[model samples]
Target: SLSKDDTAQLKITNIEGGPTVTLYKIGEGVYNGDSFINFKYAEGVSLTETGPTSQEITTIANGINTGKIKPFSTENVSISNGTATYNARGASVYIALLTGATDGRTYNPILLAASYNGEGNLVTKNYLYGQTSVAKSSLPSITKKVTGTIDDVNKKTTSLGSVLSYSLTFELPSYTKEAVNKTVYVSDNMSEGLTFNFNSLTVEWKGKMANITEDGSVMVENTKIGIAKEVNNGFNLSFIYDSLESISPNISYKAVVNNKAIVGGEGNPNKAEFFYSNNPTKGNTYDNLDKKPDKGITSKEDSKIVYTYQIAFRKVDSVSKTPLIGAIFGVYDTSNKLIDIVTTNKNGYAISTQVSSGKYKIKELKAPKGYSLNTETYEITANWVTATVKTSAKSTTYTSDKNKATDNSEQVGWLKNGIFYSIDSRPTGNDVKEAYIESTKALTDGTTFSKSNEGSGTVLLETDIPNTKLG
Candidate 1:
């Protein structure tokens, strides 16, 4: 983590004799610079261990926090040590999609591929619940759909054991022309599963799984066997998930991997092994926390976390019954958290999603021009709650003389190519005709500073007229 105090500091390591700085990894979608990336790892992984193994790496942002990147740039990540390691991680691309051969066995080097595949060019991704699946014996997992593939029947598996525990690797024999035939790494003691959808030709392989008792990340990367075709040997398309049973105490989750919860720790703290995070902050990724303060909501429908809030946009109105089109409506939570500052659509309404479930305050960040803002705070319910707001501005209308143009024949000229052109003649008020005013120069001139007669209008022509002669 780069010291917030010094952003320009270099991160030096043993391999690269450079002045390394501490980069505090926090806040999603916030790219202060190309230093330590602020990202959330799985529960069981050791961040310190999973920390960058090289000075050349990319950081991935996930979840709702992605909004931050749209407004801000993403941060870059690199390791301090010259002895490099690789990993297939959450929100990261694995290189295994590009499998190749080396030495005795086919070196299934895992590099972050352009994408994942399920079928022949078809890619679909989903999660399986170990505890909930009929195949509870088989671990349930989530996968990324790289291409437009289904993931029902494309799973294949190969096993290589008694291998040295030194590095991580990823492979994509399906997408590559090479055949797979090599032992990858010495992994933690756990049988990782693999699956694929037949129709989609999607594939899923097990990520490194282990029992975690501390808050850290198990990260590795390409540093050895050198960069072949810009490829790293110990690299992998990492699949990362927290053992719910390894992190939280006093909380029992239903789904388990190898009898461990996907996120929080299972069983009694004394009996269960899980990762413990003392300083959990916003934007950090994880499954769930143990005994954290619950924000009044219990249990999510799906696996994803959510923040719910109520937002209100005032209905726009003027001193008269005129409409205000676009107004900036800002909503803040009870914590004075700026939910978002949104402008009204043509319908004069604004909405917010994924807000922290709690009380909120609404204010006009900046009202549309010519409109005065009225700030008000209202209590919005968490579920099915709406903040109905209307904008009230001063409306004034000006009247002028009969020299104005209301309809056909009312004006001496018409607008053409942004300039006003003279009309040959003026027809009866009821006769359909194309009307215009004089040149833009004449219209702007005070001499023609005239108005249209009240309730006097002729038939106006909307489309191009081939000829003025009606007969």
Candidate 2:
């Protein structure tokens, strides 16, 4: 009879070095049918389930000599000698006991067979489990986000041709020191109209879990960082870490919109990709579950530049609404000197070049021959302040408060439905000045005025220039 002291014993060995396999056992006797067992590999080394495992090799002689059995990663077996019953299942039954594996690594497990030669349990035999391939470790995750700041003061869509400060933020996946010496890279692809400013490229790094602060954080030296260079139409940035886990990396720079970016023009589509190595098990096999060497996680974002608009004008009769032609207009800068001249073309329409949203003045230098010269100085201001739109089904839609100068002191010109209008100036003392007859001549009946007033005899004649105050 099998005694209780003749309990089943198990031992495992790892031919790949470093450590041995885990052994789990139950029941009694070397080949007791009631004995149930399972196995798990060392920590950090996961099982390739697809790798082969020995199925039935009861003797060391047959396992090593005949070699008819093949590796079976197919099942976790439970067998009993008394009932002559044995069972195999897909699910791992010893999961509750299999807990030594670490992260960033993988392992493979194999099963062996045991049997007793004599009825009195005098002799016993064992067979080593044939080898199978081990699986690869899990890969890290990475994502990138990009944002840009417009150079416009108001940060509106009107700041075309402005500089955009771009920031490419990379969120790296958490990893262990085992991920050290991994080659990481990032590539940025930009649109055509963007001119990158290499001098402004700044790279930074922070812990995966960092807190915000008033002063933010310090920057790593360029010598410790990667290489950023112009490649093709964009840039290729690469870096190597001595021993890195997870950290939030940053790549920031500036670029200018060389040409005007129309509202719906070609958008500045920017995208970035992150690449790295995740394989730590050094070997060659078909069961290697490593990530693709060339594949990477990619992210994309875009931004656009805007510019202030040009001020448009129209020349017409104040009361008659008659379109007047041959009207010459001059735009004066803040220094009161003419900077640009625009003439009223057909239908009395004139437009100025695109200018910054600011203050300026306008003067009508010469009007049509039959019309009086519009010498009144008018202000021109382009501003993106408060917006108020008033629309109707009838005549036209207008924003009465659009493009109003926030600076209340100066009378600036602004566009109203594409037509330019000046902010009314404050009344001055000269505004009240009136022209009156300085001297009157009394003439007898039938007296008439003479040319140049040479034959003046009690007839109406020209008076001296009135000393009128300027408005």
Candidate 3:
């Protein structure tokens, strides 16, 4: 009594969830072969598939689900209950029909036994006439098998949920109030494993040096050094401000490293400073632009003129031709008014830019180790209308070493690399160190190394401070 309703009443369609399957529950009844008949399966999971009743609908339904529907991503699925009359919209559900042959009736139950074949399909075995076959090959025309997966461990959770972070820092060489992009080095403290993300450039590291060479090094430039150059009686000194009055009102420039000067033996100068007059030199400020609201009588927006001043260590001999290298030099106004002092560069040249127009006294103070010191001065009347001022140096000769031994005995332990040495020898221990050999003469005014020989003298080296101009 194989009634048509009992044998063919069961129809399967889709699973329960939205288009995307977040979780799949596996258990019994609706998913087992021993309970339901005509329930088609593919892979080892449950998905919507076409049954054996209608040829075309079954072919198309199985074709689309097998080839297209993805569980948790973008894709579409097609499903059926055999013919088109009983068809409905698609979902991810788990319900199957059960049958009792002797009673000629069937029952449907929702089962928790679910599997995800990636695509939409239920998997099981089939039996017919005494032969057993797996339901996989009987599935509707599928072009290819869906083949990849992501393993979801139920016990784990993500701490950084799809958001990343990074950081960076820098160390500077010297002190300046100006803000700039500082340099740094690569080191272990870096996070994100020193990797540059394709979208953003971020970095994190610990303790990086701001200065270094390719081989990680630093080089000190040999600088020209000497003591204060003495002048004759009266060469009234003034800052040559004529050129700077036309450009700026407050013109302040430094030549010596920090505007310090000492005597013929010890206090060596390595920098110089100058300024501009009211309307004589450029009367502008730091921002030197040429256009602004003019008051007619005065305007502080124009650019000031600049000039180069070279330090000359000429030989005080019959020739007086050669320029001495590494001599100590200083700039002072009238009456030996101490201004800034600085050593010379290897080129025996330094510059004093934007000097005010006045009776200025330029002098050569200390000689290099091989050259004798020159107590000579030059008069530079601040009358130049242009921007540059060049001053010639008086010369001196090297005395015979018969006197060298006497100088050597005084500075023997303190000398190094052929230059004079002096440090803060103060009772309070506040002196800075320099690198150079020296002679025995007392360099500065106050301190001396005769009694202590504690190697407390300040050494002079050759270096220069050049102001970089911008147009």
TM-score-wise, the better of 1 and 2 is 2
Writing each residue's lDDT as its tens digit, candidate 3 over 1-471 gives 221121111123332211111111122223232334333333344333433222322232223234432222221222233211111112222222111112111111222122233222334332111111111100001011111111112111001001112221211111011111111111111122011121222111122112212331221122111011111210101111222121111111111111112111221211111111111111222211111112201111111112112222222222343333455555554555433343444444433321222344555555666554556565453322221222221111122233443222211112122212222110112332222222222112221212112111111112222221121
In candidate 1, stretches whose alpha carbon ends up further than 4 angstroms from where it belongs are 1-314, 318-322, 384-471
TM-score of 3: 0.19
Number of colliding residue pairs in each model: 96, 25, 79
Instruction: List ranges where model 3 is wrong by over 4 Å.
Output: 1-320, 386-471
Deviation of model 3 at 359, angstroms: 1.9
- Model 1 misses residue 267 by how many Å? 28
TM-score of 2: 0.40
Would you list the C-alpha lDDT of every candidate in the order shown?
Answer: 0.23, 0.36, 0.23
Better of 2 and 3 by lDDT: 2
Q: What ranges in model 2 sit over 4 Å off?
A: 1-33, 36-161, 177-194, 204-224, 231-234, 241-249, 263-296, 300-308, 317-347, 352-471
lDDT of 3: 0.23
Looking at candidate 1, what is the lDDT of residue 382? 30
lDDT of 1 by residue, 408-431 (tens): 113322222222122321112443
Winning candidate number (lDDT): 2
Top TM-score: which candidate number? 2
lDDT of 2 at 300: 27
